[PDB]
Amino acid sequence: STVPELLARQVTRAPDAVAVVDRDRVLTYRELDELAGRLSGRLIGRGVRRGDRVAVLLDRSADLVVTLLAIWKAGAAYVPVDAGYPAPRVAFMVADSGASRMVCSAATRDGVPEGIEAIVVTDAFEASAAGARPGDLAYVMYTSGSTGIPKGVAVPHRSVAELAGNPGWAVEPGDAVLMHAPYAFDASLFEIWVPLVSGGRVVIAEPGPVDARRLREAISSGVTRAHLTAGSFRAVAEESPESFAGLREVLTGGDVVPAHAVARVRSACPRVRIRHLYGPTETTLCATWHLLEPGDEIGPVLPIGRPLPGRRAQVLDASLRAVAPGVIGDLYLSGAGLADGYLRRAGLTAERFVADPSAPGARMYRTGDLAQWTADGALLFAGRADDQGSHH
Amino acid sequence: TNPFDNEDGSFLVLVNGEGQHSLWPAFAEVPDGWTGVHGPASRQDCLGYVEQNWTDLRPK
Ligand SMILES: N[C@H](C(=O)O)c1ccc(O)cc1
Ligand SMILES: N[C@H](C(=O)O)c1ccc(O)cc1
Numbered sequence: 400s401t402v403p404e405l406l407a408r409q410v411t412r413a414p415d416a417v418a419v420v421d422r423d424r425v426l427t428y429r430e431l432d433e434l435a436g437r438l439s440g441r442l443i444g445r446g447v448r449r450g451d452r453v454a455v456l457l458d459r460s461a462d463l464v465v466t467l468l469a470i471w472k473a474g475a476a477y478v479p480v481d482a483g484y485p486a487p488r489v490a491f492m493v494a495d496s497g498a499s500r501m502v503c504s505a506a507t508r509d510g511v512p513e514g515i516e517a518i519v520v521t522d523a524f525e526a527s528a529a530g531a532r533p534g535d536l537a538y539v540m541y542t543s544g545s546t547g548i549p550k551g552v553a554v555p556h557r558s559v560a561e562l563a564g565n566p567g568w569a570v571e572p573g574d575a576v577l578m579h580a581p582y583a584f585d586a587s588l589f590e591i592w593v594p595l596v597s598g599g600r601v602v603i604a605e606p607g608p609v610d611a612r613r614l615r616e617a618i619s620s621g622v623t624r625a626h627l628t629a630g631s632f633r634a635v636a637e638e639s640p641e642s643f644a645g646l647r648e649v650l651t652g653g654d655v656v657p658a659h660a661v662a663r664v665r666s667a668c669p670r671v672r673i674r675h676l677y678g679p680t681e682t683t684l685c686a687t688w689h690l691l692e693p694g695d696e697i698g699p700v701l702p703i704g705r706p707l708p709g710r711r712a713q714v715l716d717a718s719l720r721a722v723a724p725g726v727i728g729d730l731y732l733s734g735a736g737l738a739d740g741y742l743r744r745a746g747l748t749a750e751r752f753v754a755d756p757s758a759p760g761a762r763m764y765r766t767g768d769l770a771q772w773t774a775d776g777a778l779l780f781a782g783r784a785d786d787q788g789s790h791h
Numbered sequence: 792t793n794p795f796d797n798e799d800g801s802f803l804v805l806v807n808g809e810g811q812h813s814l815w816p817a818f819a820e821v822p823d824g825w826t827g828v829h830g831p832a833s834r835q836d837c838l839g840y841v842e843q844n845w846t847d848l849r850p851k
Binding site: 401742746758759762 | 792793794795796800804805807808809811812813815816818819820821822824825833837838839841842845846848849850
């Protein structure tokens with residue numbers, strides 16, 4: 400599948416439902432589709448062709464959502480660049496990804512590198528679409544992991560759709576999801592694409608970081624689901640856990656989240672669902688998750704959890720044999736959601752996206768993390784393999 | 792040390808039906824659906840084989 404295909408089902412079902420809320424600008428599903436179609440026509444007219452990478456340099460806004468969908472409708476893949484990155488980082492991402500064009504705004508126009516065509520989103524071609532396809536690239540997102548060397552993770556449409564359309568998200572048409580993660584990072588796949596394939600709405604956060612007070616205001620305005628980075632979640636959980644009250648679900652992940660933080664939220668908010676996400680950019684936002692239902696208490700340990708529907712995890716020893724529960728080993732992720740690999744880096748791809756001994760002809764992603772199973776099949780994180788010098 | 796990072800290990804290159812390449816430790820049974828196309832050879836030699844011969848990441 401592709402996210403545009405899944406979105407099209409929602410445009411047909413409820414075209415006049417709200418899709419994007421940005422300050423006083425409100426876009427319905429049909430309005431979002433039509434705007435993206437017009438910008439797609441503009442992109443095709445500037446020469447964008449299937450498989451091209453198109454860089455994006457924009458502040459979060461309705462125009463950003465329109466732009467990503469337009470790039471997809473033109474058959475191309477987006478290369479998201481944070482407008483606040485230093486110029487050498489931007490130049491590297493554009494050149495390494497092979498992007499010859501960049502969509503920008505008046506405000507970000509000066510950040511387009513020399514030699515790159517700027518397409519100013521706020522500036523007569525007719526709406527036209529080539530159409531997204533499942534095997535084509537959807538985006539190239541840059542990750543340095545724990546290495547310090549940035550690599551472009553090339554993710555196909557099929558993997559983005561497997562993530563966004565997953566039945567476990569439980570996002571419904573009445574939901575409103577707060578959008579504030581950088582679109583250069585893949586938490587944005589939950590904040591943007593999950594609600595849109597589900598019939599819900601994306602609520603663009605006012606500029607600046609989302610703190611407890613802004614979260615309370617967003618909830619009062621109708622936000623029902625919100626993802627916070629592990630750092631932000633831990634802070635609000637310890638300082639103002641009642642600020643999550645009224646959410647249907649709070650989500651968090653990335654860095655380590657201690658069980659105590661989750662326990663603080665559950666104590667303050669008995670009826671909020673709390674979801675912990677785990678996974679690398681290489682397997683599209685998250686591969687495993689742990690959900691605390693309303694009223695349930697978290698144990699002494701917060702698992703990274705169980706594989707998402709359609710995914711699998713393995714914990715293998717140094718001989719590539721599966722270990723028994725309670726034994727720490729190397730974590731490998733498989734099933735749905737794998738990236739194609741690292742753009743222009745086949746050798747690196749071949750040493751991390753490796754053959755899966757448990758599934759014919761398939762690959763598994765070597766996370767570089769350590770984990771152990773619980774007796775009934777959830778996973779506990781045990782640190783990065785390259786950070787065991789910190790465990791004493 | 793993870794076996795895929797062992798610089799003193801012996802390695803194969805494997806290729807599946809989609810043309811995707813994988814390094815593989817020579818001590819491990821080759822998974823179903825994968826064919827050995829290079830090695831046993833050093834880890835670095837296998838990376839060179841992959842870089843030379845896997846030119847399009849897209850699955851065939
Ligand atoms: N921890 C590093 C990184 O984030 O770059 C890593 C090593 C091996 C691996 O298979 C994945 C990641
Ligand atoms: N995919 C990123 C990561 O590499 O860590 C991620 C972000 C947020 C989250 O809740 C889970 C994973």
